[PDB]
Structure formats: C-alpha cells, structure tokens
Design an enzyme around this catalytic site. Structure first.
Site, PDB file in Angstrom:
ATOM      1  N   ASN A 255      36.352  32.042  46.308  1.00 33.89           N
ATOM      2  CA  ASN A 255      36.839  32.398  45.133  1.00 33.89           C
ATOM      3  C   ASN A 255      38.299  31.841  44.857  1.00 33.89           C
ATOM      4  O   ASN A 255      39.229  32.347  45.477  1.00 33.89           O
ATOM      5  CB  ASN A 255      37.000  34.086  44.909  1.00 33.89           C
ATOM      6  CG  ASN A 255      37.734  34.489  43.663  1.00 33.89           C
ATOM      7  OD1 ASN A 255      38.071  33.396  42.870  1.00 33.89           O
ATOM      8  ND2 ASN A 255      37.575  35.790  43.299  1.00 33.89           N
TER       9      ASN A 255
ATOM     10  N   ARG B 211      32.825  31.039  42.790  1.00 31.99           N
ATOM     11  CA  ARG B 211      32.999  31.695  41.745  1.00 31.99           C
ATOM     12  C   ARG B 211      33.657  31.115  40.857  1.00 31.99           C
ATOM     13  O   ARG B 211      34.665  30.419  41.116  1.00 31.99           O
ATOM     14  CB  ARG B 211      33.782  33.054  42.296  1.00 31.99           C
ATOM     15  CG  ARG B 211      34.080  34.022  41.149  1.00 31.99           C
ATOM     16  CD  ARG B 211      34.026  35.422  41.900  1.00 31.99           C
ATOM     17  NE  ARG B 211      34.435  36.558  40.847  1.00 31.99           N
ATOM     18  CZ  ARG B 211      34.630  37.735  41.190  1.00 31.99           C
ATOM     19  NH1 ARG B 211      34.224  38.031  42.603  1.00 31.99           N
ATOM     20  NH2 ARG B 211      34.991  38.565  40.209  1.00 31.99           N
TER      21      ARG B 211
ATOM     22  N   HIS C  69      33.326  40.313  35.045  1.00 35.38           N
ATOM     23  CA  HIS C  69      32.646  41.106  35.903  1.00 35.38           C
ATOM     24  C   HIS C  69      31.264  41.448  35.994  1.00 35.38           C
ATOM     25  O   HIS C  69      30.524  42.213  36.676  1.00 35.38           O
ATOM     26  CB  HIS C  69      33.257  42.873  36.267  1.00 35.38           C
ATOM     27  CG  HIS C  69      34.616  42.998  36.237  1.00 35.38           C
ATOM     28  ND1 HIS C  69      35.195  43.680  35.194  1.00 35.38           N
ATOM     29  CD2 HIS C  69      35.391  42.805  37.398  1.00 35.38           C
ATOM     30  CE1 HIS C  69      36.556  43.768  35.881  1.00 35.38           C
ATOM     31  NE2 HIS C  69      36.748  42.919  36.864  1.00 35.38           N
TER      32      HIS C  69
ATOM     33  N   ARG D 144      47.478  45.505  32.627  1.00 38.84           N
ATOM     34  CA  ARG D 144      46.539  44.938  31.511  1.00 38.84           C
ATOM     35  C   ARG D 144      46.622  46.268  30.349  1.00 38.84           C
ATOM     36  O   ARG D 144      46.010  47.326  30.850  1.00 38.84           O
ATOM     37  CB  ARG D 144      45.689  44.294  31.676  1.00 38.84           C
ATOM     38  CG  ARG D 144      45.590  43.039  32.541  1.00 38.84           C
ATOM     39  CD  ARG D 144      44.542  42.129  32.303  1.00 38.84           C
ATOM     40  NE  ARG D 144      44.302  41.115  33.537  1.00 38.84           N
ATOM     41  CZ  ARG D 144      43.313  41.270  34.055  1.00 38.84           C
ATOM     42  NH1 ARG D 144      42.306  42.268  34.115  1.00 38.84           N
ATOM     43  NH2 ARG D 144      43.009  40.394  35.321  1.00 38.84           N
TER      44      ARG D 144
ATOM     45  N   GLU E 189      30.244  41.527  45.456  1.00 39.20           N
ATOM     46  CA  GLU E 189      29.935  40.224  44.610  1.00 39.20           C
ATOM     47  C   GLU E 189      29.591  39.076  45.465  1.00 39.20           C
ATOM     48  O   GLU E 189      28.810  38.195  45.061  1.00 39.20           O
ATOM     49  CB  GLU E 189      31.306  40.197  43.864  1.00 39.20           C
ATOM     50  CG  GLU E 189      31.566  41.212  42.713  1.00 39.20           C
ATOM     51  CD  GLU E 189      32.974  41.224  42.514  1.00 39.20           C
ATOM     52  OE1 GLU E 189      33.993  41.626  43.316  1.00 39.20           O
ATOM     53  OE2 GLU E 189      33.396  40.823  41.275  1.00 39.20           O
TER      54      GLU E 189
END
Lengths: 394, 394
Positions: free
Chosen positions: A8, A83, A172, A233, A378
């Site tokens: 990633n 990713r 996601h 956020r 993941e």
C-alpha cells in the site's frame, strides 16, 4: 512454499506485508515512512527505524527488496499485490497489471490526485524490482461499481457527471467485500439471497449496503470525505454552510478543504483528539465536548446504517469492522442501541469480548437482525485475488 | 366574525391569505409578485394582475390593505400572522411581535440573508398599516429546536458552532408540526408515546423525525440546501466533489452556490424540468434522463426516511405532505416500495385516490407501519398560533 508481497504505497509511506500463499498468514510486515522528506526511515515489525533518508519511492521499495532477500524470501515471491486508491468507472474487479492497466489507472488518477500518483509510483518501482513476478492491482472503489445510477448520481447538472465523471465512488471496497464474504459463513446466509450492512469504522469510516453479494449503497462519495463523521474528517456537511462560512471568515476552498479534512471530525468537536481511546477516557473523566464528539459520531453512524438499509429487500445482518469497529465496545453498544427501531437486541457479555475472539456474533437471540464483529483483512483479500489471478494465462 | 391575515413576505413576492378565526377556512388569498422590479403586480384569487409597478414592500402591503377594506374586512382583522424563514436558537415557538422580537429576528437574520430581511420588511409594513392589531411571528425552524446536539452539530471545528452559530436548523417546521399534530388524530396515536417520519415533498423537500411529539431529526441543514435532492436544489453533496469541481472548471463558491440552488436537482439531472408532472410524462414517453431524475429523487427520499427512523424508539407512521407528497401517486409508491425493509405494504387503490380525499391512510393492513397522506396547511397552523396568542395579556 511461495509468498505474496502486498504493497500500500501512499503519499507519505509504503505500508507493506508478506503473506504465505498456503495459509494467507502474515510472515512479515513493515512501513517506510517519511517519504519525500529528508527524514525517511524503514521499520520492519516496528523494531529498528533504519537509515533511508532523503530517498524516493523506488529506493524505499529497494530497501524493502533487499530486506526480503536478507530473510531468504526474495526467490519465493510469486505475486505482488498493489493497493490502488481510486479506479473510476474502468475497474470493476482486481486485475493483472499490464501497460494497458497503467494507462487506465493514469487516466482515472485525476479523481484522486494525492493517493493514486503514489500508487502508480509504487507500481513502477515494484515492476522494476520484480519484473519476472506477476503483479496485480486491487482498487478501493471497485466493489461499489455495482451501484445503480440512482445510488451514485449526485443532484448536480448532468454535464458534471458525463463530462467530468463526478459521481459517488465510495471506498473501503476491499474491506466491505472481505467482511461481507466472511459474513455469509459466520451468519450462515445465502450470498444470492441476503442483505447486509457493513460498518467499517477505522481511520476513515464508511457504511456499505450489500444486497445479494453486491454493493448497492455506500456512505463515502466521489472523495472519501462524504458520509460518516470521522477522526479528522467532517463527513456530511451542508454546502450552504460551507459557502456561508467562506463569506464570513474570508477563507478559500483550499482553506476549507484543509479544515474539513484535517481539523474537523472527532478532533474538531472535541478540541482534544481524533483517537477514540483518548476521548472515551475524556468522557469517563467528565469532558462534555468529548462526550458530544462521540455521541455525534455514534448518531451519524446510526443514521447511515438505517439509511443504507433502505437499499435492501431484507436486513439479515449488521457487521462492525476496522480498528474502531473491532475494538470499541462502547461505540458498538451506543450505535446498536440507537437502532432499536430495527429491532436490534445486543448481548453485552458477547459485545464485551475483546478482538482476540475474532469473528463473533454480538446480538441476543430475540434480536430480529443479527449483529456481529468481523475483523477486516484487506491484505488477505488482496492476496486471495492475486492467488486466483496467478492461475491465468495472459 | 373576526379574521386572521397571514403573510409570507418573501424576497420576490408577498403571498398572503385571510382565514376566518371561527373555522380557519380561507376567505381570501393573493400574491404581490415582481417586488423591487419595475414590473410589479397584485393578483387576488388569480383574477386580475393589478397595477402596482415599481413599488416597495410597504406599498404592496398597502395595496393589499386597501383591497381588504374594499371587501369590508379591514375592521375584522383581529390578528396578523407573519412567516419568518429563520429563528436561530432564540425562537423555540411562535411569539407575539414586539420591539424585543424585531431586534431578535434582526440578530439571527444573518443566518438567512435573502429571506429574513424581506420578512422583517413585511413586519414593519404590517405594523405601520395595522398598529392596533396584534401581530405574531411564526418561524420555519422553531419546531426543530428540540433536536439534541448529536443531531444538530456538524463535524466541523467547535469554534464554528459556538462563535458563528453553524449548525443544523432545518425548515418546513410549521408543516412538519401541523402534519404531525394531524397524524396523531388520523392514526389514533398517543402524542406522548409515538414516532413519526414526515416527508414534506414540495417546492423544497425535507424529512423530519417526530418522537413523542418532538422533532428529533430533520434532513435540511443550516440552509435549506441540505438533505433531499429537490426541484432545482442538489441536496446532499460531497464537499470534496464541490471542491474538485471548483479546481477543474475554475468556478467560485458564488458560482457553485448558484449551480447547486438554481441549475441542480430534478432539473439538473433531467436537463428538462423541475416539475414532476413534466418529468413523469417524460418518463412515460421514454426519456431516460427524466426516469433517472425521478429514481434518484425517490432513492434519496427513501434513504433519509429510513435514516431519520433511527432517531425513533418505534416507527408508527410515515406521512407524505406538500405539493408533491399530496399529489404524486407514483413517487409515493416508488418511495414506499423502496422501504420494504421496514415492512411497508402499500394499498394501491388507496394510494390511487387524488388529493380531494384529503387526510387518508394509503397502506394495507398487513403493513407493519402505517402510511398516510395528510395535506399540509401552514396558514392554518399560523392562524391557530395567532388565535391562541390572542388570549394573552402583554
């Protein structure tokens, strides 16, 4: 005994892992942080911030490359999984990386400038360092490409959609996908006849409605900024308010884009921390603003859980996942208690159990809908794709 | 035989009505449009665009004043009700207008610049023209002031809330209130033990969760731009997307604030009309973009209906109201069919009935939640307040 190397490659770091193909267990993990800065380091297993100062993405990966060889697992790397943050409308599933695919990622990259251009940097690097090795792209948005237009269109001028590609993508996808696959086993559901809501609460936070194995709704938008309120956020925000604020404080969109991404969310309300553990104790210690941050956080999760349930014919399950969803006993209870309208009954001793207990139901039997916690993985999902794609003849 | 004169004094017009205190029936209605323009007219009952050119708010009202006297109902005006767009956190109920109240409206006015300053203009005018007459302010936001912080806080820096008053206010409060009061009779519910969702679909569109007679959630935000997609208003929109658009098309916030309010919504998607009747026929005639506009419209209504249900302990009813909610058989069916997850069963012959049938259940008996249509009457609700307030000793 072959292995997959998962990568990633973000804007600031390169989070990697090495899984065994046989068992999908992690044999090695690490992170090359402080990228592009003069102060850059590589820490395998969190054991020795190495010397990698003022080095680029390809150097970082070469550092990790030499560290794989040092542990005699270079000539065992059968597959490399990458990713990718954003896949636009071009990528509906994981794919074997080729020149066509690079071009295609480069085309949709403008939809996520920060992240994608780093993902591309990781791909060029990996391909240099491992050219005989099959490589695979897994996109964080591709699971949500089964959404209908009514689910993904914004209420803006059509031109903004058709010309500029402005629509809900959602993120996601790899987690929501993995977790949902696992849900079918844990709940003994028929994929083809099922309806799950998956609340991935972590770093970023998103909900996803999964009808009959397909994503039909998701809370995040074109950017990962829509939907749930998160750590830093804002989540959902009245554009009228954002506009009003601009005229009142004399700020730009760049100013406000920072505020909404970096100074907002749990942190913004509490004025204390984005970390739930800090705030949870802050509330226990009697901090009102921490209490409000969590209550708001919980309120918006409930709101979107219930809303996403509208895209289902039947609600069989709600599945919590991610750092916060796997480890937060309070948040899970408050959220579930906020959905008594759906007939949820919680089992507190079962909800009390730590994440060590893994995939686990947390609802009482009278509960009309099953609640469960399913640790996301993941990296395992990326591997399982890469493995599958390893059988292909290009 | 006394009467109340109700006045909605907007930015472009002055929509008025005269109700009989005894029966609350409308004896007279009208509209002084084209205000501030040279081309200004007054049309009572839609029967003769009169001469009122290049006249101000006080002239328009004097024109209507002389027209009331012309029909020998000037010395019968016991009460004047004023509709106010925005009440901030100062107004939790309807109030008798006094100097204190003008000041207080003038303080919260910056929260809704266009509309409130026209409402104030109407109040000064009415008070000049009818000084011996009791006057009352009814605020479009005050019903939603029972919302908890978790329900009304945005995920922005706390400072933006405490310093600048940036929070969810919500609108259609008078309608949501009236409709809900009526719901308790039509459904034979106990106000003190109940949970309704009210879908006010018209001009603007908003949802409201009413728990135990109190508003606990509502879809519109600080501005009427949040929540449902509407005729020309976008509704919910990823701020990341709005930011991205700005950088791609080189537009301002003023530019985008227009787009989101005037070129967006049903119109924006269809590229045809904001009017449902036009689009409904457009779909029947095979227009795909009209079909998409309606499907999106319907999808977002469902999403928010279900979401707002999370703020309820029990869902006893869903009530449609407003121009679109009272008259649109298709939209009502599509929305209800989108909430099969809540166990809604629709009765199509009952849903087929036109608005002439008034307050009416539209769900079959197997339906786990009652659906109904209840015509809103904001003017009657304004009168009933004014009447009640008429008994007070100031």
């Amino acid at each position: 005994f072959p292995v997959v190397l998962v990568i990633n490659c973000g804007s600031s770091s390169i989070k990697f892992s090495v899984l065994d193909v046989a068992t999908c267990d992690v044999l090695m993990a690490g992170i090359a942080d402080g990228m592009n800065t003069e102060n850059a380091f590589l820490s395998i297993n969190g054991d020795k911030p190495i010397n990698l100062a003022h080095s680029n993405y390809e150097d970082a990966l070469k550092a990790i490359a030499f560290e794989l060889e040092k542990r005699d697992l270079t000539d065992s790397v059968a597959l490399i999984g990458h990713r990718i943050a954003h896949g636009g409308e071009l990528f509906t599933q994981s794919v074997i990386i080729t020149d066509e695919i690079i071009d295609n990622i480069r085309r949709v990259s403008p939809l996520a400038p920060l992240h994608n251009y780093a993902n591309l940097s990781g791909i060029d690097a990996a391909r240099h360092l491992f050219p005989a090795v099959r490589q695979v792209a897994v996109f964080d948005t591709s699971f949500h490409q089964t959404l209908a237009p009514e689910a993904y269109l914004y209420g803006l001028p059509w031109e903004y959609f058709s010309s500029l590609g402005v629509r809900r993508y959602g993120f996601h996808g790899t987690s929501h996908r993995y977790v949902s696959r696992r849900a079918y086993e844990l709940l003994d559901l028929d994929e083809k006849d099922s309806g799950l809501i998956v609340a991935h609460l972590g770093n970023g936070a998103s909900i996803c409605a999964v009808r009959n194995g397909q994503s039909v709704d998701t809370s995040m938008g074109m950017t990962p900024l829509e939907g749930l309120m998160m750590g830093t956020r804002s989540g959902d925000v009245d554009f009228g308010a954002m506009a009003w604020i601009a005229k009142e404080t004399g700020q730009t969109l760049s100013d406000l884009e920072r505020v909404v991404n970096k100074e907002s969310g749990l942190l913004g309300i509490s004025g204390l921390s984005s970390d739930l553990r800090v705030l949870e104790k802050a509330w226990h210690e009697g901090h009102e603003r921490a209490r409000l941050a969590i209550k708001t956080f919980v309120h918006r999760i409930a709101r979107h859980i219930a809303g996403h349930a509208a895209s289902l014919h039947r609600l069989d399950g709600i599945i919590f996942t991610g750092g916060i969803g796997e480890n937060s006993v309070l948040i899970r209870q408050l959220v579930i208690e906020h959905l008594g309208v759906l007939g949820l009954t919680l089992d507190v001793e079962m909800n009390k159990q730590p994440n060590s207990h893994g995939e686990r139901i947390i609802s009482a039997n009278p509960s009309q809908v099953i609640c469960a916690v399913i640790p996301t993985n993941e990296e395992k999902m990326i591997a399982l794709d890469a493995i599958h794609l390893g059988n292909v003849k290009a």
